């Protein structure tokens with residue numbers, strides 16, 4: 001019989017009427033030191049928050065009513081062994097898009113995220129890489145249940161993380177007003193010209209902008225005043241309303257009563 005130990009975030013996890021007690025020592029040491037709060041537990045997990053680049057060994061004392069055995073584990077460095085735990089995920093849905101809110105699931109530990117998504121009916125998985133912690137997936141079908149799981153990563157330290165539990169959400173009934181489409185910027189004179197397509201006539205629109213870098217690991221979208229409630233599928237505004245830089249633009253439609261969901265966010269490099 002022998003034991004190994006895995007680490008997820010701040011927990012030692014044992015892999016093989018019994019209780020467990022954990023000791024450790026720094027490698028090249030005589031005696032064993034008890035890990036506080038990890039003595040006579042039923043759980044195979046020991047939370048050790050309270051120096052992860054130092055080499056250590058563990059000793060696990062497996063006890064019963066009248067007998068016990070003490071197993072040592074090979075030397076390890078906790079950081080090198082650690083696995084990143086499953087992130088916490090919350091989903092929200094529109095008719096044709098899903099928004100994924102992600103946050104870490106702390107002593108051991110910036111994270112890069114990835115996900116896997118599939119339609120419940122089909123099970124065909126699409127993998128999306130390098131997503132951020134409020135990612136939006138477009139081009140989905142209304143009243144359709146999608147399922148997904150998310151993992152964290154630390155590409156610098158070559159760690160690939162554990163997937164969150166699966167979460168599913170059903171997209172809502174189709175919005176009668178679809179989002180504006182095909183958004184494009186061009187320049188005329190000292191102005192920018194924002195153009196888009198729309199499926200219905202006699203609509204009004206609004207355009208909002210955001211500094212693009214603000215999207216990472218999160219800010220208020222702001223109106224472009226000239227574009228506010230425009231009655232056609234374009235607006236013209238002075239170049240000098242934006243400093244040089246990288247922005248995001250989005251457009252929403254209205255019939256005076258209801259609004260579409262937002263168009264996709266488009267990159268705007270001045």
Ligand SMILES: *[C@@H]1O[C@H](CO)[C@@H](O)[C@H](O)[C@H]1NC(C)=O
Nearest residue numbers: 118119120121122123124147
């Ligand atoms: C779809 O959902 C059913 C439960 O309704 C579940 O049993 C099944 O595993 C899911 N399949 C996929 C591919 O997500």
